[PDB]
Every structure is written in C-alpha cells, then in structure tokens.
Design a protein around this ligand. Structure first.
Ligand SMILES: *[C@@H]1O[C@H](CO)[C@@H](O[C@@H]2O[C@H](CO)[C@@H](O[C@@H]3O[C@H](CO[C@H]4O[C@H](CO)[C@@H](O)[C@H](O[C@H]5O[C@H](CO)[C@@H](O)[C@H](O)[C@@H]5O)[C@@H]4O)[C@@H](O)[C@H](O[C@H]4O[C@H](CO)[C@@H](O)[C@H](O)[C@@H]4O)[C@@H]3O)[C@H](O)[C@H]2NC(C)=O)[C@H](O)[C@H]1NC(C)=O
Ligand SMILES: *[C@@H]1O[C@H](CO)[C@@H](O[C@@H]2O[C@H](CO)[C@@H](O[C@@H]3O[C@H](CO[C@H]4O[C@H](CO)[C@@H](O)[C@H](O[C@H]5O[C@H](CO)[C@@H](O)[C@H](O)[C@@H]5O)[C@@H]4O)[C@@H](O)[C@H](O[C@H]4O[C@H](CO)[C@@H](O)[C@H](O)[C@@H]4O)[C@@H]3O)[C@H](O)[C@H]2NC(C)=O)[C@H](O)[C@H]1NC(C)=O
Ligand SMILES: *[C@@H]1O[C@H](CO)[C@@H](O[C@@H]2O[C@H](CO)[C@@H](O[C@@H]3O[C@H](CO[C@H]4O[C@H](CO)[C@@H](O)[C@H](O[C@H]5O[C@H](CO)[C@@H](O)[C@H](O)[C@@H]5O)[C@@H]4O)[C@@H](O)[C@H](O[C@H]4O[C@H](CO)[C@@H](O)[C@H](O)[C@@H]4O)[C@@H]3O)[C@H](O)[C@H]2NC(C)=O)[C@H](O)[C@H]1NC(C)=O
Ligand SMILES: *[C@@H]1O[C@H](CO)[C@@H](O)[C@H](O)[C@H]1NC(C)=O
Ligand SMILES: *[C@@H]1O[C@H](CO)[C@@H](O)[C@H](O)[C@H]1NC(C)=O
Ligand SMILES: *[C@@H]1O[C@H](CO)[C@@H](O)[C@H](O)[C@H]1NC(C)=O
Ligand SMILES: *[C@@H]1O[C@H](CO)[C@@H](O)[C@H](O)[C@H]1NC(C)=O
Ligand SMILES: *[C@@H]1O[C@H](CO)[C@@H](O)[C@H](O)[C@H]1NC(C)=O
Ligand SMILES: *[C@@H]1O[C@H](CO)[C@@H](O)[C@H](O)[C@H]1NC(C)=O
Ligand SMILES: *[C@@H]1O[C@H](CO)[C@@H](O)[C@H](O)[C@H]1NC(C)=O
Lengths: 105, 128, 128, 128, 128
C-alpha cells in the first residue's frame, strides 16, 4: 500500500532520490517515515527516522524529506557500498511500521 | 500525577528526570560532645559546606536560584557527539555523567568567564 | 554497543510451531522493546510485532493477531547499565508460505515518537 | 523618619511592617572546647543552618535575593477570605501567621512547582 | 592571555583587577576532636560564616550572584572627589579601600534601602 520506487542508479559522486507514497491509510502528514538500508538476506540498518533525522553514525550525505503526500530519501555522493535495497516504512508513536515495496539502487 | 520521590527518576531518561528537579533540590540541606554528638555535628557542617559549594558554582555562572539556566557556551562536539533525541529520550543522568566526566572541568571554566564577561558587557550597556 | 544473537536456522514442515530465540548483550535489555521482523521471498518485508521487556506489554500486526506468541524472560544484571536478555517467537497455524529469514531488532529510543523503532538487528535465521 | 529597629514593627500593621524588611533581614546571620566554647560553636552552626533553609525555599520559588517577590499562585480564598484592606491595614504579621498557619505547607508546594514549570517554559521560549 | 592567579592583580589598577573577579570569587569557600581536629573544624565553620555575610549584603542590595552590579545610589563627592580616569587607571583596590574606608558604612545603608524601595516599586508596577 506504501508504493516505493521501481529502481534507479547514478554514479560515483552524483546523487539519488528514492520515493515513497500511498493513500491516507499510511501517508503522510500524520505519520513518520523511516528509511532502512536493507541488503537482501542480511542485517538491515536504520538510516533515518522521523522523516529526516539520521541515526547515530549515518553519513550526512543521506537526507530525508517529506512532502504532504510523499516522502523522499536522497543519497548524495555515491560510493560502491550503496548497491543495496532500500525500504521506507510509516509509523506513529504507538503502532508498527508498515514497510514499503522496495527499491534497488 | 507521578511524583516518583527523592531520586525517583534516577533510572528515568534525562528529559524525564529534568522535570523533577525541585524534588532533589529541597533535600540537599534539610550541643553535647558525645560519640553521637560529635557525629551529628559533623553531619551538619558537612551538609552546609556541600550545599554552598554548588551554590557558589551556580553563582559564578549567572545561575543563582535557577534549576534550569541556559548559557552562552556552545557545545563542543568533542565532549559528546550524541544528538538531542539520543540523549534526553535515551540516556539517564547517571550514565550521562559517566561519559561527560572527563570534560566537566573544562565546561566549568567556560561558564565561569562567560559570566564574568557578560556582566562586564552589561555594565558598559548601562553606562549611557 | 549491543548484540542480538539469534537461534539456529533449522527447518520444519507445515502444521508445526517453531520457537525463535534472540539473546541480547551490551545494553540494558529492559530499556528497549524487542521487535520481530520477517523478510519473506514472496512478499515485502513485514513487521510482525514488538514486546516490552520491562512492562510485558506486547503489540503485533493484525496479520499476526491470533497466531503469534511473544514472550521474554527477565534480564540478568551484568553492570550498572549492561544486562543479558532473551526474546522468544512462536507461530500457530503455520504453513510453508511463511518461509523466509527472521530477524529480531531492539527498539530505538526509550522515549519520544520513535521509541520501539527497530534499530539494532540480529544476524537472522533461515527457515523452512 | 521612623526606624523602629529590629522587630520594631512586630505590633504594626502588615502593610506598615512590609516596608521595614531589611531591618530583620540583616540580623538573621550576624576554638577552645570549654563549656562556653561548645555553647558558642552551637550558636554559630545553628544560625547558618536556619538562614540557609529560608534561602533554599526562597530559591526553589524564584525569589533569590528578593524581599518582596510576586508569584503566579492565585490566592485560594479557603486559606483566608479576608480582603486586602482588612489585612494590610488591619492585621499584624504575627496574628496573620496564626490564622494562615494550617495552609503554609500547602502554599509552599504550589510556589515550588510554579517555579519549576516556569523555568521549563523559559527554556522553551529561548530555544528559537 | 594573562591569568595572574589568586590575588594576582592586587597591585594592578582598579580597572585591570576588575576583570579578574571570578579568580577571587571561587577561592572564598573551597570528625575526631584532636588538637588538629578542633583546629580544622574551626577553619570550616569560619569560612562558611564569612562567605555568607558577604552574600547577605549582596542580597539586601539586589546583587545576588553578581560580580558587577550597578546601583541607583549616586556618588557623593565627599566620599572621593577623584575622577574616573585617576581611579580605574591609577589606584589599586587596596589603596582605594584605604581612603574610602570611613564611608563604607554610609554607602552600605544607602544601597540597602534603595533595594528595599525598588522592590516595593516593582510590586506596585506589577499590580495592574
Ligand atoms: C523505566 O524504563 C522503562 C524502559 O525503558 C520505561 O518504559 C518506557 O517508557 C516510555 C515513556 O514512558 C515509553 O515510551 C512511550 O511508549 C508509548 C507506547 O505505549 C503505548 O502503546 C501501547 C501499545 O500500543 C499501549 O498498550 C499503551 O497503553 C497503555 O498500556 C500499557 C500496558 O502495559 C501501559 O503500561 C501504558 O502505560 C498505557 O497506559 C501506550 O499507550 C507511546 O504512546 C509514547 O508516546 C507518547 O509519549 C511521548 C513522550 O513520552 C510523546 O513524545 C509522543 O508524542 C506520545 O504522546 C512513548 O513513546 C516506552 O514504551 C516504555 N517502554 C520501553 C521503552 O520498553 C519507563 O518509563 C521507565 N520508568 C522510570 C520511572 O524510569
Ligand atoms: C500601634 O497601634 C496604634 C493603634 O492601632 C497605631 O495608631 C494608629 O496609627 C494609624 C497609622 O499611623 C492611624 O491612622 C491614621 O489616622 C490619622 C488620623 O489622625 C489625624 O487626625 C487627628 C485628628 O484629626 C490629628 O490630631 C492627627 O494629627 C497629629 O496629632 C496626633 C495627636 O495625638 C498625633 O499623634 C498624630 O501623629 C499627628 O501628628 C492626625 O493627623 C489619619 O490622618 C491617617 O490617614 C493618612 O494616612 C493613611 C496611611 O496611614 C493614608 O492612607 C491616608 O490617605 C492619610 O494620608 C491614618 O488613617 C490611627 O489613627 C492610629 N490610631 C488608632 C488606630 O487608634 C500605631 O500606629 C501603632 N504603632 C506601631 C509602631 O505599630
Ligand atoms: C605593575 O605596575 C606597572 C607600573 O605601574 C605596570 O606597568 C604599566 O602597565 C600599563 C598597562 O599595562 C602601561 O600602560 C600602557 O603603556 C603602553 C606603552 O608601552 C608601549 O610603547 C612602548 C614604547 O613605545 C613599547 O616599547 C611597548 O611595546 C612592547 O615593549 C615593552 C618593552 O618593555 C613591553 O614591556 C611591552 O609590554 C610591549 O610588549 C608598548 O607597546 C601603551 O601602549 C598602552 O596603551 C594601550 O593600552 C591602553 C590600556 O592599557 C589603551 O587604553 C590604549 O588605547 C592603548 O591601546 C598603555 O598606556 C604602562 O606603560 C606600564 N608602565 C608604567 C606605568 O610605568 C604593570 O602593568 C603592573 N602590573 C601588574 C600585574 O599589576
Ligand atoms: C573543542 O575543544 C578542543 C580542546 O578541548 C579545542 O581544541 C577545539 O578547538 C574545540 N572545538 C570547538 C568546535 O569548540
Ligand atoms: C577519560 O579519560 C580516561 C583516562 O584514562 C580515558 O580512559 C577515558 O576513555 C576518557 N573518557 C572520555 C569520554 O574521554
Ligand atoms: C505463550 O506461551 C506461554 C508459555 O507458558 C503461555 O503461558 C501463554 O499463555 C502463551 N500466550 C498466549 C497468548 O496463549
Ligand atoms: C482550594 O483548595 C482546595 C483544597 O485545599 C481545593 O479543593 C479547591 O479546589 C481550591 N480552590 C481554589 C479556588 O483554588
Ligand atoms: C487548623 O487546624 C486545627 C486542627 O485542630 C483547627 O483546630 C484550626 O481551626 C485550623 N485553623 C484554620 C485556620 O483552618
Ligand atoms: C553627602 O553626604 C553628606 C553627609 O555625609 C550630606 O550632608 C550631603 O548632603 C551629601 N551630598 C550629596 C551631594 O550627596
Ligand atoms: C577617617 O577618619 C579618621 C578619624 O581620625 C581621619 O583621621 C581620616 O582622615 C578619615 N579619612 C577620610 C578619608 O575621611
């Protein structure tokens, strides 16, 4: 129900802008958005939470943004280790996170 | 409401315990020379000494009679690079003092001269 | 720090009910929720539910409303801020369509709006 | 002018005695172990203790160094339904304490948290 | 910079020493009954008494927690007819106290009632 992006890529030095949106059920103005860097079949990683706040240790090139209808995840200054699958997820303070479909970068 | 008591929020988050400061503030201060009498007199002079050393530092920082005073000394990230949400909504005041313990003397000087210079600036502004 | 070693990656067949273990270290096990996340192959990653090692209060997705039993045992104090805990996961009317890698992840913060958020994950376990 | 001396306005009206507060304020604080020496040492430690207990309450109310500080705690008429003119131009501070004595502990808490919350509001206002 | 130490600017000009006040401010305050034990206890009770007598005068003048507070008492030239440049850029704090010593008690009363009346005026202004 939280339709992410199909996929895309850039190049070493450029940037990416992943998307994430849905209906009034899981998006957006009354929900927070978190983005997980999730290699397939491995331990995931919390990149940002609360729409744009990064986790401790996340590179400043990772940036989040939430419009009134869609949340974005920019990945500036690409590096080799960025070839992973990213997932957004929407949540409130007293619920669970409805993850997104997925996006191969 | 809650009212956890004296030191009741010692295991609570720093942001939670920062709302019950009067609880610990009021318990910081409240002759025959026998073995018990000498013992009690030492407990009395020690309490007033410890209470006034903290009030002295609170004075040379421009924080007299304040439970929460804001300063002008910026936070050198070399002290703690943690963010606000992972400090006030995560750590407790006990473990916070455990990792800020090395730099507590560095900060106590920056607040001391920032107040000495501020009161010198305030006198210059009221000189007209 | 913090670690969440998970159980073995053995396999069973439909109709059964397996238990998944998650052993914690390097952090106070009572201060953060324990989340159970599923990464199936024929579906997007799903959040199954979190439970409170401190209050015992559990909360799971309605897709696992009456099929999953989440339990945690009390922690063992190692130091003032370090303990060891364990979290358990079970399934009821189990088939072979729930196949995938299962993870356990502790909460993010102790207070705020991102309290239970799966922050520190385990290595995962392969299933049927 | 007048200058009635230390406690000179103890029989005066509350509004009259409220203008001679510095008179009583400055007299609140101004080794051989013989029978007189132990006696004098007890008189010294007792005076500093009593003086600092009042300065402590004056601090947790936001009244540090104030002879007359105004608060935000409204006057519950169940304490005393008397009017202003029949209090300041009628009663003395002695008999006033005699009829407000029951509620002096109730008021001391309302002033204590009104200051704890005010300094929490002031920090939020200077956060921008 | 400089940092002359405790009393390091005792021979410096009044304007120079007026910038190193925190140096002297922090050194104003920092049980077996043997001949040394009775000696040390007297040193402890004496220090807190002398420290609080100055903080008391600093309070009845509206100067609580201030190293440099400005008052409303005008300078009666009969105290010292010297000009500002021949005081702050000439005299030392030692010799200044030597020639202002006679009138130090006169000034201590003018500051005491100027604060008592100011707080009476502030209450009247907040009565609307
Ligand atoms: C000791 O240490 C423990 C563990 O660290 C502390 O427990 C944690 O406390 C914090 C803050 O109090 C909790 O964060 C809050 O989490 C709630 C989520 O719970 C809500 O949802 C539940 C499931 O949906 C629901 O069952 C709850 O409703 C009642 O039921 C339980 C049954 O056990 C009952 O115990 C509850 O008290 C409820 O009465 C509950 O509604 C979330 O709602 C909070 O968000 C609100 O508050 C924050 C500010 O706190 C605010 O920013 C938000 O906008 C929102 O308004 C908040 O996130 C945490 O869940 C607790 N558990 C952990 C971390 O495991 C304990 O407080 C410490 N005590 C002391 C004295 O130190
Ligand atoms: C101890 O307790 C006693 C008794 O309670 C107190 O005495 C009372 O003091 C108050 C305030 O000081 C008095 O109220 C004032 O009353 C005067 C009225 O007197 C005037 O009129 C007289 C007749 O017309 C006149 O003779 C007076 O003139 C002089 O003569 C007498 C001779 O004895 C002399 O004693 C006087 O001192 C005069 O020098 C006098 O002018 C009234 O004028 C006052 O009103 C003014 O002041 C108020 C503020 O106080 C102000 O609001 C008004 O606008 C106005 O400006 C005031 O009402 C009271 O009369 C006294 N007697 C009682 C109550 O029986 C005594 O003060 C207490 N002392 C201490 C130390 O506690
Ligand atoms: C103890 O007591 C002594 C004696 O009273 C004090 O010494 C006096 O200190 C004051 C302030 O510090 C001095 O006033 C200043 O005078 C200088 C003039 O010197 C300048 O010019 C020299 C010749 O042209 C030059 O050589 C100097 O340059 C260096 O060389 C000397 C070599 O010895 C070295 O010692 C210097 O330190 C220099 O590094 C020097 O540049 C004048 O420039 C000052 O004016 C500036 O500062 C004032 C404020 O102070 C400001 O208002 C002005 O606008 C301008 O910016 C200032 O007038 C005085 O000359 C000293 N000697 C006396 C009085 O005989 C000593 O300070 C006391 N110490 C303590 C700890 O109490
Ligand atoms: C932080 O402190 C160190 C010394 O402790 C100093 O060298 C550095 O310049 C400071 N940096 C900032 C940003 O304050
Ligand atoms: C404080 O200093 C000690 C000195 O040995 C060091 O071991 C410790 O890591 C320091 N802590 C911080 C937070 O700098
Ligand atoms: C989970 O398992 C425990 C094992 O003793 C059991 O007591 C408990 O009732 C189970 N939970 C539910 C909801 O049945
Ligand atoms: C006065 O205090 C009583 C309890 O002492 C309380 O029940 C009442 O609501 C208060 N009323 C007002 C007006 O403050
Ligand atoms: C205070 O409490 C006592 C308790 O016996 C009571 O007799 C007295 O009337 C009370 N006074 C007031 C002013 O409420
Ligand atoms: C100075 O003080 C004297 C008494 O010490 C006084 O008579 C005189 O009026 C005062 N003058 C000024 C200008 O304050
Ligand atoms: C202070 O008083 C003494 C009294 O003998 C006098 O000798 C001295 O000159 C006076 N000093 C001043 C500055 O008035």
């Amino acid at each position: 129900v939280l339709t992410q992006s199909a996929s895309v890529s850039g190049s070493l030095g450029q940037s990416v802008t992943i998307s994430c949106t849905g209906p009034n059920s899981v998006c957006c103005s009354h929900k927070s958005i978190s983005w997980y860097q999730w290699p397939p079949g491995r331990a995931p990683t919390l990149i940002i939470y609360e729409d744009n706040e990064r986790a401790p240790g996340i590179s400043p090139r990772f940036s989040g943004y939430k419009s009134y209808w869609s949340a974005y995840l920019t990945i500036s200054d690409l590096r080799p280790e960025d070839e992973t699958t990213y997932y957004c997820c929407s949540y409130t303070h007293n619920s669970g996170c409805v993850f997104g479909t997925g996006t191969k970068v | 409401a809650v009212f956890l008591g004296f030191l009741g929020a010692a295991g609570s988050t720093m942001g939670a315990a920062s709302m019950t400061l009067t609880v610990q503030a009021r318990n910081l201060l409240s002759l025959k020379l026998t073995v018990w009498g000498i013992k009690q007199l030492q407990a009395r002079v020690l309490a007033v000494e410890r209470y006034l050393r903290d009030q002295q530092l609170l004075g040379i920082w421009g924080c007299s009679g304040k439970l929460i005073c804001c300063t002008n000394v910026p936070w050198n990230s070399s002290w703690s690079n943690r963010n606000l949400s992972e400090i006030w909504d995560n750590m407790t005041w006990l473990q916070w003092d455990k990792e800020i313990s090395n730099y507590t003397q560095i900060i106590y000087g920056l607040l001391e001269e920032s107040q000495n210079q501020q009161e010198k600036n305030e006198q210059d502004l009221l000189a007209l | 720090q913090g670690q969440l070693v998970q159980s073995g990656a053995t396999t069973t067949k439909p109709g059964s009910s397996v238990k998944i273990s998650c052993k914690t270290s390097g952090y106070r096990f009572n201060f953060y929720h324990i989340n159970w996340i599923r990464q199936t192959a024929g579906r997007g990653p799903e959040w199954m539910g979190w439970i409170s090692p401190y209050s015992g209060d559990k909360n799971l997705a309605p897709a696992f409303q009456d099929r999953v039993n989440m339990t945690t045992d009390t922690e063992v104090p190692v130091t003032s801020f370090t303990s060891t805990g364990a979290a358990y996961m079970e399934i009821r009317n189990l088939t072979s369509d729930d196949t995938g890698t299962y993870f356990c992840a502790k909460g993010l913060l102790r207070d705020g709006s991102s309290t239970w958020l799966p922050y520190l994950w385990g290595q995962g376990t392969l299933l049927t």
